Every structure is written in structure tokens, then in C-alpha cells.
Design a protein around this ligand. Sequence first.
Ligand SMILES: [Mg+2]
Ligand SMILES: [Mg+2]
Length: 755
Amino acid sequence: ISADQVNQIIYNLHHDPFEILGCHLLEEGKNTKKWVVRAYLPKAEAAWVIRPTERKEDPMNSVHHPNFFECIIETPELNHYQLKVKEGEHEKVIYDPYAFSSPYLTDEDIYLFSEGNHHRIYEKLGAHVGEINGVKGVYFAVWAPNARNVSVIGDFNNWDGREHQMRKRNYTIWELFVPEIGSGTVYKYEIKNSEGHIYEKSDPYGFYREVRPNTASIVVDIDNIYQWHDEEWLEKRRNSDPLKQPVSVYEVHLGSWLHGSSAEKMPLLNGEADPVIVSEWNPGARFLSYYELAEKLIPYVKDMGYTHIELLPIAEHPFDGSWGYQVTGFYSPTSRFGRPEDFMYFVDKCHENGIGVILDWVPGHFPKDSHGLAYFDGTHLYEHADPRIGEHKEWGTLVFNYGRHEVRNFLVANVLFWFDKYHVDGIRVDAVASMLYRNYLRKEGEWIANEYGGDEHIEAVSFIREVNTLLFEYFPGILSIAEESTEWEKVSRPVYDGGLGFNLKWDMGWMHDMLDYFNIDPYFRQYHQNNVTFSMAYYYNENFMLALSHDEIVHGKSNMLGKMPGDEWQKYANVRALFTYMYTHPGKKTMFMSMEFGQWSEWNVWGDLEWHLLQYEPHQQLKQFFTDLNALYQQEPALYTHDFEYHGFEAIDCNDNTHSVVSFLRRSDDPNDSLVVVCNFTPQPHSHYRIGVPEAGYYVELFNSDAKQYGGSNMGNLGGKWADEWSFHNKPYSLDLCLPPLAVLILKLDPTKVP
Ligand SMILES: [Mg+2]
Ligand SMILES: [Mg+2]
């Protein structure tokens, strides 16, 4: 490029910047091509072109002006890249804003989509505000290869699509531009299938939707509705390893955390909307918006001291009672809580308060609801045609055909979508077994094996690896969490080592051992000491997430307190002991809303939590307990730097089953950060209990779950205890401790203390 051309860009005299900025072919070689990417980045000193899927990074050079950059790259195709931009001391990563000249699909789009590799297909499929033949309007497009005809119906044509019949392209995708209309437009696709049958569909790539039980899609100008402020958070995340950081997650179901009154409007971000009544049976209650949740949930979580909030599925879903696990609008945040910008605001605000956001994502199945994906074009399009692999008969749902390219693409681009447009920090996938096995919940003779006679669902496995491969390449630094319940191997290991590519796995075994154990009367826990006995062999095969989830306080299992034996004082003590144990055991942490204040009743998705309990001291104390423990967890490196290395944990003694006492060390980079943890899982206190430690010195009583401010009896070691030179448990020195009843202590050597 020339200076004259650069100047035309810098000073806004150029008639079409897309001619120059973005990616352009320079020439074709025998087996490769030569491209240039150009970018005008005012205030940037430096830039790079990232090719995350090829694992490459090329720097850009300033050209004729300090803020005009180019980068010449040789490669056969250059479909997938990002720009890294440095302003002062800060970097950001972004998609190239001059990536797409036109709103309509190109041959190249269509080709990539057919191969299942269009990582940004949602830029072209769905509905997008743009300009064609010099007029502003909306471009629509939808994949429906076997349809006889498709038309766009909506407010703008009184639901009569005779003058808005779409044009089929490449025997595969229907499109139409409609001038003059814009964002807010309400619409569906009217489809005629091969038999002549006519029926309406919501837009599978729709970005917003009417409020359930209505189903029309709504047009959104998704790149011009919200201004972000979270560059610093994103940079910090890209440049860190979250496995080495504290990760304490508050799991929340947005629809049942807190309700408001249906006698007023739902405030949104600079606006308001009609209330969304939680149910016909509770009509005085409405949902809170994403906006009101940002104002209320976020400072709450910040005070509690959690690092992340994990949301039950927020993709658009028709039935509250599914909890979100049955999705019909994969590309829109549910309209129960307001608008897409309101949820952007929610994420932006978590990030301003140093809180991350993890989404439950549901790629395993979808329901039969006739507005959604089912039998989409009068064939089994999204779902596989054979019900032995394409239905979960016991759940009443359909299973995506992962081997079909445009279906894989639907899903893979969807996961990337949430990271791109809504800046989320991770995902969690429920019931991963449901994808992995060809015989899942299927009786004998009612399923078929793979091409090698195995039970492994090959296509699905391959899809899962692509999802995790691409996520981490595009957004290093995120969390990809799996719950997999069949001891499948290498869930949270890299795809290159034969793993599924997640970086964390829920420890369901740990969960059952914990809840079976605390449920047993204290006397009888001596017969079940193996539950509280760390198992090196199993633990280090996965990066574990210790989750006490929503699934464990429904359907007659009781909430946490109800699970525990004893009188009221003991039930609380049990909760404090279990969770103090959980925060000290290796692994990341997840707990569900209502557990942190001792809700007595089971989570009920149709109401909100029992906030009135926080008027009373026991509930308050338990909440101060979680507040302090989260603070502790963030301040003590040995609780998070080495969850997944041998160094991080060492058992001290695990054999006093007769008293249900267990003890261990946690460690970090500095030996002075080591922590001694001692747990007493009965109501019997102990005035002299000797515990081996690694060094002489004074050990501070850093945490004590029996403290009176947590509702405990306040027994303890009054500040800490000098070690005796007295071998015990194969350790040179030892402590003679007071152990409080149903309680856990954490001690820490202060090596600068006056003997
Ligand atoms: Mg009609
Ligand atoms: Mg209530």
C-alpha cells in the first residue's frame, strides 16, 4: 500500500475503507496464497495478527503512519484470525472489524458452512441490520435445504409472507433482504415442506425472542446496543492460567434467586418493560431483569467473596420447569429477564467487580417443541433420523446429529458466540455421558454399536474435542467444565493426549462420599472413614471441581441442613465442617444459592429463595462463615496454587476412624504459606490431640469453624499453639491441640514470632 491511500483512511477521505482494511488476497502460489491484513488502530503502538486455530501469531508493521498497520501472511486460506492491539501498557484481542464487506452470504461463507467450519456463521445466518443496493434494512437467512418454500412473516407484513418469499441459495440456504425495517422487528419463518405442509418456526440463529410462551424472534442490532468496559478483565484472563487461581463459584438459577412484584414494570437499562409473571399460580410475583440482577446479585456475590457466578442455562427456553436444560433458542439470552443489552450489562458489571461468569451450556439435546429445531425443514435436519441415536426416549427429547456438518457448525459456533458477543468466562456442560455413549439409557436391542463394535458415540466425541480445541485457541484463559458420570477417561485433559479437552471435571464421587458421609449419625462415621480419605491414585487423573450443586437439594434430598443428623446446633456445625473441609480439600469449589445462609427447604424453581431467614442470627452467622471462608480462600495461596500437583497436598493422619479425625497439609510456592488442616467430624471435643507438623515454630489458629461468630461453641487454641519437639505421624515436630466439636481448624506457621 501507498501513503496517499493511507492518508485517505487516516483523515476520512476514503470512499470505501473495506477496499483497503481487512484481509485481501495479494497472489496465488502453487500450494498456498499470500494475503495482507490491514488495520487502522488509532492510539495503538503495536499489533499482531493471531491465527488461533493454526497456533500462530504474526506481528503487524506500521506503514506510512504510526497507527496504520499491515501484515503479510502466507497460507492457503485465511478464514480465522484475530487482531491483538497494544495501546500503552494494555492489550486487547478482537475480531477484525473490517472482516465482512457485505451483509449477505458469499460463496466463501456457504462453502465454509458446508464443511462445518464457519466459526462466525452467526454473522450471516439469522437476522442482521445492514445495507444492500444502497438501502438500510434487514437481511435474513436460514438453513433449510429440503424445504419447498420459505417466507418471512412478521409485524411488518401482518404475518402474510406472500410478498416476502425468500430465495434459495446453493440448494441449501434461504435468504431475503427487507428494506426499511430494523431492530425490534418481530418475525418468524413460514415454511412449506416437501409434502406441502405449511408451519411456522422461530429463527434458530435468532438473537432475541418474545417472552414465553410466545415464540416470535426479534431482530437485534447486536453490535450497536451496548458499550463494554471490561478490557482490563479480558486481558488479565487471557494472560493467566485459571487452574492456578482461586475459583469459588456461586451457582445461581436466575429465575428463582429473587422475585419482585408484578404490580410494577420491569426496569431495564435506560428503559422498562412489562412484568414477566413467574406463574399463573403466583401472579403477584415477577422475575427480575438482567439489569436488576446486576444491581442486586452482583454486590451480593462480591460481599460473599465468590470469584465466579455460574448460571443455569440462560439460552431461550420455553418451560420454566426445565430449569433451562431444554433449549429452543440457542442464540438468545432468555427474554424472561429483559434484553440482550441488559445481560451484556450484567456481564460487564461482573467484570467490573472482579467476578467471572460461567454458563451452563446445553449441546446434548433439544426438545420437540414445534417452534424450535425439530424436524426443521420437513426432515430430520438438526436431529439424527434414526431414533436409536437421535432421541433420548426417556427424556422425551431429540439428540443433535453431531456428524452432520451444518449441525456441528450450529453448535460450535454457538459456544464461541457466547464468548464473542457476551464476553463470558466459561462454560459447564451437564450430563456429558449423554453425548458420549451410543447406548445411553437404551435397553438391549434398542441401540447399535459404532463402526468398530464399541459403545462410544464417535461423532459426539469428535464434536466435543472440536468445541474445546477451538474455545481455548480463541479464548485461552477460560473455564470449560464437564460433569461426566461414568468414569470416562481424560475428561479434563488435552485433546492431543487423547482427552476431551475440558480443564475441569465435577467430582461426583467426592460429592456422593461427602453427602453419604455427613448424613450418617456421628457415632457411625467410624465405619465410613474411607469417604473422608483422600485417594491420590483417583484424584490426580483429572482437574477436579468440587461441586455441591442444585441437583443435590431438590426431589426429596433436602437442603444442606436437613441432610444433617443431630439437633439444630449440630446440623449447622455439620454444614460448617463439611464446607470448611471442602474449601481445604484440593480442587476448585462450586456451591448453589441458598446453601450459604442455611435455607431449610429444598430449592423450588417456581418461587424465590427464603430471604426472610436472614432476619435471624443462625442464618446470619452461617452467612458470615461463608463470607470469611471465601476471603480466606482468596488470601491463602496453599488453598489454590497447587490443587493439581502432588506438592499441594500431603496426608498427615487418616486412621483415627474411631474418632473420625482427619488431618492434612496444603502447600504452595513459598514453604511459609503451608497450612495445617485438622478436622473433627464428631461432637466429641478433644483437649489434647497431637498432630505432626513439618517445622518447629508458632502455628496461628488461622481459621476455626467452631468460632462463636459462626454459631459455634468457641472452643479452640486461643490464638495458636507452639510446636513441641516431639516426633509424631512420621514428622519431626508436633502440636498438642484442642479440637472443637464438629469442626475444622486451619493453622499456619508464623515464622516471625517472639519465642
Ligand atoms: Mg398467510
Ligand atoms: Mg419468596
